[PDB]
Design a binder for this molecule. Structure first.
Ligand SMILES: Nc1nc2c(ncn2[C@@H]2O[C@H](COP(=O)(O)O)[C@@H](O)[C@H]2O)c(=O)[nH]1
Ligand SMILES: Nc1nc2c(ncn2[C@@H]2O[C@H](COP(=O)(O)O)[C@@H](O)[C@H]2O)c(=O)[nH]1
Ligand SMILES: Nc1nc2c(ncn2[C@@H]2O[C@H](COP(=O)(O)O)[C@@H](O)[C@H]2O)c(=O)[nH]1
Ligand SMILES: Nc1nc2c(ncn2[C@@H]2O[C@H](COP(=O)(O)O)[C@@H](O)[C@H]2O)c(=O)[nH]1
Lengths: 468, 440, 473, 447
């Protein structure tokens, strides 16, 4: 990483304190840029969904992995539900997406609430595995909530065999009144659905898959209790990647945790803790971790800096840690504090292999949390921090709970036009691809190497138009 | 103190300009760190309440000291009063708390207790938030037993049947978290303050008789002739009590005050709370830079430094201790509590708050009464907001202590002296401080 | 009923336009008043839950019936659901209340939402049919919403055999950590739940029960299609009372419906249509209806007045309709426009045998509508009008999609309103406590020992302008 | 009472539904009017403070009693509390008021909070009884106790401060007298008991044993007994009145609440000299929204006053008093006195603690008596308990004391008498002409 001549700040740098300078560019198009990651995570786009209960569900795992990202399941989640989630995800189709399925005896109230858990804007009425019709949000408006799918379903829908060409079903949905096409297995059961926009993304994004060509999914583990036994179970569960997570990454308990999991020789890539320094970055990798997660305080749910005063500007933290991981033959995850696509690109420019996106994605449809509204009828979802699950560890529950970090809350409002998380992946990946062409990079490794950066003042960040 | 490479600033640093960098730590939890102070104040937690009248009352002195802090009492208080408040505070129970009570809301909000006891000749006739329908318990009861029995108010009774006090749910919890700050006799610690005007020897000597466990000789400008002579006067009597002195932001002044016989040096000028001096004078200095310099200067002579002024957040408390301060003094943030002398008022939004007032001229140096009175520093005021749920100071003490304890685990210190020794700090930009979630 | 001398207004009266004048009373307390009804509804208190999808569920049915009220199931509800609802309600205990069930593997998100489906404020965790833990409203706070119930539910709770006297469970709960008392059958299975207030109400309210001692429940029918077959089907489905309902009750299609149902001899009480006039009350009773439901326009979800201009002030409507019904030996249900207990008492003082309550009860926990939270995050629920289900249509059988859309254009749309829960006490039983407390007082103010005496002994007067503004909201 | 010719409405009338028609008057000034009450209550002005925990304290009872009003202490208060409250009121001077006590060691903020407990706007800093000075709003003027308020008035004119610290002959203070406080001494005449000091009343419920409670209250110093219940026409009231009267306590007996002449007769024939009148107009009364039972207060006072006077009785107008017009209209309706509710809770002397508003204007909290006005064992009756209603009455930013409201009230009534030509309240009732108005009629003028 290099800075413009004359720029050597007297302070550590945030994402807002820096900018990228366009260099000479031989790259013709944005689609000529390969966004695939070299860190062994398997992500074809530089996006990792943070491990948070308010963020990473089974639905988020499906939709993101199909678009090339990866979703880390939250820690302290029962092994039975972990194994059930990963089986759900790895059973998903790579092109078509799993819709919200309904039964004809369900209430329109339930139908309307379940519709918003996915970005399709329509639900499929099913009998046994086999679609009998479609329910649209427009048809649920103005009707009786407790009338059960009486006259709702149109029963006439454009349908195509599973594994058809996304460009043909794209054409099939051109003259169709509804934008959803149901896709069926050769036996007649429902394979899934594909939106006209979904067919487009299939040609753009490369799904993140295992050797079987099954959607990738990861899971997180705390350093409390027996870490080796816990990590062993999640490995057998089919988790493609393991994340050892705690608030303070540089610690005695953390290093012993990596050694405990690595002593089992699970052959899985190990992500380790949170450290903003090179010395911590060096110790975690030496402990047997392949990748290190980096930050303290940038998280939107993180009150650490206002409480403890501990923390560090994320850009400088990523820059320093990526340097330490590179020399030790490893990689760095930029973790927390990504509001805008700029923060993603700047993190990669800092040398991070992958960026971990938090509560920003809690404001989508596929988010596990329930969709709420305002008096203004503006859609939003409430995001929460992982809280105690990120820390180290009846009368005791109230006492220790007194000094313990309280779970933080913030309102993430949905985009009233496009609320799906894939739409956010459009904004993120489009921005980064332009960052690559501005610098002239054909891929991520070239980006970090060729990038020229500079520092700005407060008036510098105010330049330009704020996004929607 | 250690700084990052290239982080030597072109400006002086406030609490907002800096951050603490994590390091290798063998300390697992917040309960494994010792918050006790080595400055000889007697506090089990590094928190001192300011000598403003708008903050430190009898209720404030009782509440904080019980949780391990200490409250220095305002100057311009008749010694008859400081004696009774000391007598009041030192007569308190270390576990049970004194309820607000009157003969058969503004009074109910004077304490963090959810209820008030109605009393007749010492014996409770029951509660206002109803005779035998609430829970009682004799004094000497373990807090865990009171906690269990409340599964949020439990009236504690003296063996004769009268009212000894009250213990709430969190109050029962907190008996086993905080170690009370007590003198040799096991009574809650309390301190007093004096101006440098008039006779300081007799004032200080008289306060030592009033039961003050610590003496504060306080003035607006710490570095000057009248202060040095004043410290010399107090130390000459050799009362044996800890001496903190004045306010100075310079390394030399910190030493000058110590050489005069003061053990501790209060440090800061102008960030303040009710202080208009920066906008009035322009005199002052960023608090972190000030403390870091003064703390280092005192440690060389074996002295200690109280970080004084400009503490909004638990962040500022940890940073001051990391700056080398043995204790921190919090003026205004505790005016925003229940235990503050000012009653509870509300405003436009349903959120509560309290009005804080400044010392001003009281920290400074019939024709002369009006003429010198015209230049009095006017009506310092501001709005400190309560936490809409928990308005008690002990809840702010939870925050403060929870943060600092966690700071130590981050740096890897097992105590406060190790915090300053093991800490690495760096400078941040505007957007740097904006990182993370704010506090409620 | 008679009015104070000099009061003969030139306009018809609403609930806000009138007041009850106190009179000499030998009645000491409100508890000595008999709230039982003479209309044959079987209700021990003068409240009927309106037939609307936003108010009357399976939970509203048992909760109100246990306290002596009755719930009318909405018309055009699938009979499969009615029979399912009837069987559920009539299988409920007269004392013990049906609790909210959770699993050890359930999410706190699911736990907290299901928790508000009842007024218990607590939810029982079950293992193999046998209760283990208990989840409280307060017990979910500051916890990860997706955490399991194992580390949540507290297994220390008071217990007691099913069929225990309500007075004992009350004293058992005084020293208890939690307000709820879990009821267990001797075999160990979960019988149900009884709260402290639930124990108190057992000594106050007397359940409305059928011939076999099972909680009473009603059902409604529109006059479109085959009414005889629908009514016959609901009667065999276990409905203890039948309600024939439409917007305009004074029209021939309604008259034929009553005659059709009454010709089947179900041996059940008949409520018929909605009429604001004395002539309508007679004609419906002369059509074979035992009871006459009364109002046009006072309904909270009703747009009739703003659309058509048709309607009548509810008080003046009830006083006239009740009087005409008594002469025919029938009874009148006051239907629509009840904001306050005042409207319930005035309706009875007007001569109504029973008071039908709508969207007000949609603002409770037991309401079938899902619980929502606003800006201030205070609890509320949405109420909806029955719309076209209350209207009359021609035969739509074998229609055209054009005709289906044609008739749908002028069709009445569903109106909506936000009904706020009381943040402290959000159950419908708390409104029943509110309503019955007010009506019982009116009886003592008038000096009536029961509802029939109230109508007889009541003196009324008219007010205007500042008259309504007196008192506190 | 005779309404204007042609006015015979189809409804009963509230205070806002009526207006007084002026008539020929030989009455020159307001001070020539006699506001005295003929009901034998002992009030020199037609003002009775309602019995509620939100309004009548010991401080409220002192302040209005020296201005001629009377306080009815809320019922179901401990006999230990009423005695101490009475002992306080009976310990008060007739002329000079009681100051707010301070001390050199107290704070600036606490001094201001304690200051609002009185309308003095000033507090006396005292040392072991000896006043050392004063604090005024944002040294002292001293005069001996029982001086001429007209002389003290003059001393305060030459003073920078408007309050006078009154020093007892041996040293130290009996109390304080303001300029306005000295003026009112020439206006208002204190209501006194048989012992020559401030008069006070007490309320009792009809539940339990009334006679024993009334006996206890009477020996506890209550000069007037009030038998109070939501519905006064019930039989348990007849028992209550006849019970208390049989004790021969020699005190004025006011009873219950009735809006009807039939109720007024029965209670009077039961031995009640005065009948308190209303159902529902009360600011804290939710009865009308709950029960539906009630009646417009003006029509209630009209019919009941006529029935009472026929039996040689009297009528207290109870509830619905907002503006001074309501007081005058009640007396014009034939009431011997007017009972004032939560309106006074919006003063300084109210026991309710003072809060601050969004606009940073003073307001106080008022609350209802609820079940105390009504007719395991506690829990069953506690579930049907009528919730205590809550309303917020805002103080006048300028004059926040209750004496200031008394100035308003007594000014309006004295002015009402001059319009009709009455020299007193009995003449007010006989000489008054009334009329009916619409919503637009009441909206005329400056609120
Ligand atoms: N200290 C703390 N960090 C959190 C908490 N919740 C999430 N985080 C961190 O913040 C990251 C995402 O933050 P975001 O991208 O929403 O700003 C997570 O991957 C995790 O490292 C929390 O409750 N406390
Ligand atoms: N400079 C100055 N400092 C003051 C004044 N009044 C109080 N202080 C000091 O302000 C400190 C509190 O500041 P805080 O820590 O609340 O920001 C106390 O230690 C107190 O001595 C003042 O008027 N001027
Ligand atoms: N016109 C009309 N009246 C309705 C509708 N829904 C309910 N109602 C009437 O309103 C009554 C309930 O009114 P509520 O008690 O909620 O104010 C019902 O019993 C019925 O008489 C509707 O959709 N349209
Ligand atoms: N029913 C009832 N009446 C009340 C209550 N509180 C006060 N009142 C009545 O209302 C009167 C107050 O009148 P106002 O506040 O309108 O001037 C009281 O004197 C009393 O008669 C209450 O809580 N319930």
């Amino acid at each position: 990483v290099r800075f413009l001549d004359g720029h050597t700040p007297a302070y550590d740098l945030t994402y807002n304190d820096v900018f990228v300078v366009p260099g000479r560019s031989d790259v013709a198009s944005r689609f000529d840029v390969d966004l695939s990651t070299v860190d062994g995570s398997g992500t074809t786009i530089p996006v990792v969904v943070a491990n948070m209960t308010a963020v990473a569900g089974r639905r988020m795992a499906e939709t993101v992995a199909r678009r090339g990202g990866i979703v880390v399941l939250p820690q302290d989640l029962p092994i039975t539900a972990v194994s059930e989630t990963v089986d759900f995800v790895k059973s998903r189709d790579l092109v078509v997406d799993t819709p919200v399925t309904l039964s004809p005896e369900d209430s329109v109230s339930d139908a309307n609430a379940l519709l918003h858990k996915r970005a399709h804007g329509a639900a499929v009425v099913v009998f046994e595995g086999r679609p009998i019709g479609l329910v649209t949000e427009a048809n649920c408006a103005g009707v009786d909530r407790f009338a059960r799918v009486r006259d709702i379903a149109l029963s006439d829908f454009v349908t195509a065999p599973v594994g058809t060409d996304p460009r043909e079903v794209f054409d099939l949905l051109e003259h169709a009144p509804i934008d959803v096409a149901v896709m069926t297995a050769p036996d007649g059961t429902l394979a899934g659905v594909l939106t006209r926009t979904g067919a487009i993304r299939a040609g753009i994004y490369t799904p993140a898959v295992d050797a079987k060509g099954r959607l990738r999914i990861a899971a997180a583990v705390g350093i409390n209790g027996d870490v080796g036994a816990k990590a062993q179970a999640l490995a057998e569960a089919g988790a493609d990647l393991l994340v050892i997570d705690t608030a303070h990454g540089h610690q005695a308990k953390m290093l012993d945790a990596i050694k405990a999991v690595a002593s089992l020789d699970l052959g899985l890539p190990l992500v380790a803790g949170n450290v903003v320094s090179a010395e911590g970055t060096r110790d975690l990798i030496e402990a047997g971790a392949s990748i290190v997660k980096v930050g303290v305080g940038p998280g939107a749910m993180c009150t650490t800096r206002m409480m403890t005063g501990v923390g560090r500007p994320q850009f400088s933290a990523v820059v320093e840690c990526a340097a330490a991981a590179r020399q030790l033959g490893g990689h760095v995850w930029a973790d927390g504090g990504v509001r805008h696509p700029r923060d993603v690109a700047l993190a990669l420019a800092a040398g991070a292999s992958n960026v971990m996106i938090g509560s920003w994605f809690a404001g989508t449809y596929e988010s596990p949390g329930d969709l709420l509204f305002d008096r203004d009828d503006r859609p939003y979802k409430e995001s929460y921090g992982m809280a105690s699950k990120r820390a180290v560890a009846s009368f005791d529950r109230a006492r220790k709970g007194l000094f313990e970090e309280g779970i933080s809350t913030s309102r993430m409002s949905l985009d009233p036009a496009r609320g799906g998380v894939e739409d956010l992946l459009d904004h993120i990946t489009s921005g980064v691809r332009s960052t690559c062409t501005y610098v002239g990079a054909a891929n991520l490794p070239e980006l970090h190497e060729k990038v020229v950066l500079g520092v700005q003042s407060a008036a510098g960040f105010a330049e330009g138009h704020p996004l929607p």
